[PDB]
Design a binder for this molecule. Structure first.
Ligand SMILES: NC(=O)c1ccc[n+]([C@@H]2O[C@H](COP(=O)([O-])OP(=O)(O)OC[C@H]3O[C@@H](n4cnc5c(N)ncnc54)[C@H](O)[C@@H]3O)[C@@H](O)[C@H]2O)c1
Ligand SMILES: NC(=O)c1ccc[n+]([C@@H]2O[C@H](COP(=O)([O-])OP(=O)(O)OC[C@H]3O[C@@H](n4cnc5c(N)ncnc54)[C@H](O)[C@@H]3O)[C@@H](O)[C@H]2O)c1
Lengths: 475, 475
């Protein structure tokens, strides 16, 4: 008795059939009506081909490249009779170029990252700033300015970026209610931004702890993760990056801003997966997270910016990832950065290989009158296995978020290029929540200055515990 | 047919019966002749009591403290008929005070660390310099000056500090042959220092990689290690510390020296178990180690110091620990520092819980004509079980070193206060080698600049790859 949300009146082209594609395909088949032969999967991998053949879906074993993407995707997306849907869950392909092609041809589009064409991330002719997610996001914002309106294309609608934007909205509404502030839920961007300002939210961590454990010990010289290894390593080697709040009064010497764009970002001249921050989640309590760059770090800070009449920002929250991956990924990062190079092999943990654990993923709003508030999902691998096949808990949070964005795009098909912060957060969470396990809000009195200073001198700001000065792990 | 080296006619007083005591006692019973009833074990824990009772050995369930150690230990050391042997394998006791008591009463003494009385490691009034192993070692050096000669007391004779001092001497001999350096084998401290200078040894890593894996996944909120958790955490929270070589051109801003003493060391105003360094071992290849303070970092650099007539140091190698512990300890450190406090529970892995792996422990001599040379032990858990009971591979490298130090002290019982660098390294390795598994020398062309600079600017010294400026990892 699963709900069927909408009929798709055209081709469904899934680009990429890795961990997320494999988890999303069953949800698409479950929740949408369409003729079976309308759906086709594109992935160059032989392992992906064999899995698709076993599931009985059409499969085209090809890499989408800058050279072929028009000749390949335009016929597939315009096969008729009506509007198709491009579901982009790949690596090494330009989200912007495919998004623009889909829009030119009237097809809906969704992805989970602003990915560039193969060769971008390690091109030595690029300055660190050009490798930032801020710069990639600005290409999408410029595309929206150049062609406002038109067919809906949802950028960066996964678990994070994606779902966490909806959690921020629900958390802000919950904070206001827990303070006795009633009525008038925000409906415009400026109203959301002023709610965060008015409640005194200084910053937001994307506070995640993955406790999924494997049935085999970590193999030497193998990178192990619960989702894309190539994707995670690629983003881990990008500069550490954060949305930068107006309350901050210190940044590292190797921090830099941007000459252009929305104004909400800084980056550090060091890899994010080797940069630690002090953070907190309900199950982990105090923990280190890695400051891996993510689209929502910028987009959430941008969304919640209040400007004056002159257009200058007067309020903006800090926002960044504080990611504690599964234990085998922690070991994998230690191995990779300690050897100076990528391991010779890698593997993504299948649900059949996971003995227990959860993916605790939420937002940590701090600086307000109740200090810190964590809101998000505590989905376990055991619950995952009972409600959705072919994925672990990490994957289900992502694939259910793509499902939600697809429902929203089908229900709002003339909205133009949108981010997760632009969607109806209540409708999206209504679609996604059956796949999120426990969704809870927890207050804590912890701050980054708990237990500090210790036995060594430290550079801290005791008048403001949540300053980045105190969060960043430094010598 | 294990060799029985000597008969011990006096009391054998073992202070502490933890992981090392439990591995050393069977070796003492195997390799020395004596009546079992002259053994006495002192330990405050019930777990130790039951283990000692299971071996039918006399047990005293007491913590040795500053308030009771004289009245508790003097009768035991002087019970006769022969000369006593105090084997100190404890935590929370003063190595110096117990050592001086033993010498005062004509009893031999051996320990594996310069330990202070309980309370020192976390006294909030102590300046960081006073919490350094340099300072603790200076208390032993002063005792030797104040009372030269006399009954032999062996300070810091475990695997590291201890065995690695003998590896350094053998490695210097191997390097001299391979580099064509001619001359008689050195037989005095000055001649060893001169050999290291003449070979161009810029520095030495105590380069260790523990690959022992457990049969169960790491539990949350449990520190897991292959030896003393309390001792490892205590030394991990002391300042990072190293012997400081004359070739070094740079030290970090938070580095500090010493106004008095042998002059061979610096320390950093940060905990050593959260300080990473770039290093290398044969099985690990390039890896991160932690810069945990160790007595041998100072003692080896001091031993290999060449002075001019004025008394000023003209050559000294850098020397420090570069320790990659077992995977569960790596996770335990990330957990402990990430939370800001010790875990609620801890456990030491038993040989029955270890499924495979080795304790690769050696010395990496670098800066010479063949770049870098690693010499040491690759003892596996499988070999350990075949040759010695009640311990893992980490433990056996330590207990066999205590055995070797005991044999040397019996054959040299009036040598005064001595460090491992002062013992006859060939005789000690003759006793220890049956318990070390493969002992190999390996050259490598790896340097700390391999693959650098990369995607980001780095504060490196391209003129000399082995500078500490290139080894230390900045966060
Ligand atoms: N927003 C989020 O929450 C979130 C979470 C996880 C992953 N992601 C992103 O989703 C994407 C997929 O993650 P994943 O775990 O499935 O990764 P994955 O590595 O498992 O799978 C990637 C797939 O892309 C395919 N591929 C490679 N080059 C291709 C090309 N040129 N054309 C088509 N396909 C190609 C590969 O064969 C592979 O099957 C990644 O880009 C990742 O960054 C987003
Ligand atoms: N040099 C080396 O290679 C090396 C290697 C490992 C350990 N060590 C050192 O050896 C020592 C023993 O290590 P371990 O692994 O056996 O430690 P452990 O923690 O396993 O055991 C310590 C024992 O000391 C006992 N103890 C505590 N307080 C005491 C007191 N006041 N008097 C007497 N006993 C007391 C405890 O009850 C326990 O049984 C530690 O100090 C450690 O730092 C040296």
């Amino acid at each position: 008795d699963w709900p069927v949300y909408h009929r798709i009146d055209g081709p469904i082209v899934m680009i990429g059939f890795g961990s997320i594609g494999r988890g999303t395909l069953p949800l698409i088949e479950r929740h949408f009506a369409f003729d079976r032969s309308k759906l086709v999967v594109i992935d160059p991998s032989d392992e992906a081909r064999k899995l698709a053949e076993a599931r009985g879906v059409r499969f085209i074993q090809q890499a989408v490249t800058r050279d072929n993407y028009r000749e390949l995707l335009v016929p597939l997306l315009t096969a008729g009779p009506g509007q198709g849907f491009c579901v982009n869950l790949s690596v090494d392909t330009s989200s912007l170029d495919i998004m623009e092609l889909a829009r030119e041809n009237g097809a809906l589009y969704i992805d989970t990252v602003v990915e560039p064409w193969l060769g971008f991330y390690f091109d030595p002719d690029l300055k660190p700033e050009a490798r930032s997610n801020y710069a990639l996001r600005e290409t999408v914002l410029a595309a929206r300015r150049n062609k406002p309106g038109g067919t809906t294309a949802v950028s960066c609608c996964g678990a994070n970026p994606g779902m966490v934007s909806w959690f921020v909205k629900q958390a802000l509404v919950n904070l206001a209610a827990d303070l006795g502030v009633t009525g008038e839920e925000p409906t415009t961007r400026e109203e959301w931004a002023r709610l965060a300002m008015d409640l005194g939210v200084k910053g937001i961590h994307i506070a995640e702890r993955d406790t999924q454990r494997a049935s085999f010990p970590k193999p030497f010289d193998v990178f192990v993760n619960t989702f894309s290894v190539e994707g995670f390593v690629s983003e881990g080697l990008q500069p550490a990056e954060l949305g930068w709040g107006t309350f901050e009064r210190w940044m590292p010497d190797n921090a830099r801003g941007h000459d252009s764009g929305c104004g909400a970002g800084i980056y550090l001249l060091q890899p994010g997966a080797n940069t630690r921050v002090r953070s907190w989640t309900p199950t982990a309590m105090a923990q280190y997270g890695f400051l891996v760059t993510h689209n929502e770090s910028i987009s959430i800070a941008d969304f919640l910016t209040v400007r004056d009449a002159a257009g200058q920002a007067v309020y903006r929250p800090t926002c960044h990832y504080a990611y504690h991956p599964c234990n085998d990924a922690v070991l994998s990062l230690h191995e990779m950065f300690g050897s100076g190079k990528r391991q010779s092999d890698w593997r993504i943990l299948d649900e059949t290989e996971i003995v227990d654990g959860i993916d605790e993923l939420g937002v940590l709003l701090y600086g307000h009158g109740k200090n810190a508030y964590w809101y998000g999902s505590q989905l376990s691998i055991e619950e995952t296995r009972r409600i959705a096949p072919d994925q672990n808990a990490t994957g289900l949070q992502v694939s259910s978020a793509v499902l939600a964005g697809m429902v929203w795009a089908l229900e709002n098909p003339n909205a133009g290029i949108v981010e997760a912060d632009d969607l109806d957060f209540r409708r999206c969470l209504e679609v996604q929540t059956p796949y999120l396990g426990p969704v809870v809000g927890v207050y804590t009195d912890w701050t980054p200055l708990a237990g500090r200073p210790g036995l060594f001198p430290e550079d801290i700001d005791t008048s403001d515990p949540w300053q980045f000065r105190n969060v960043l792990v430094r010598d």
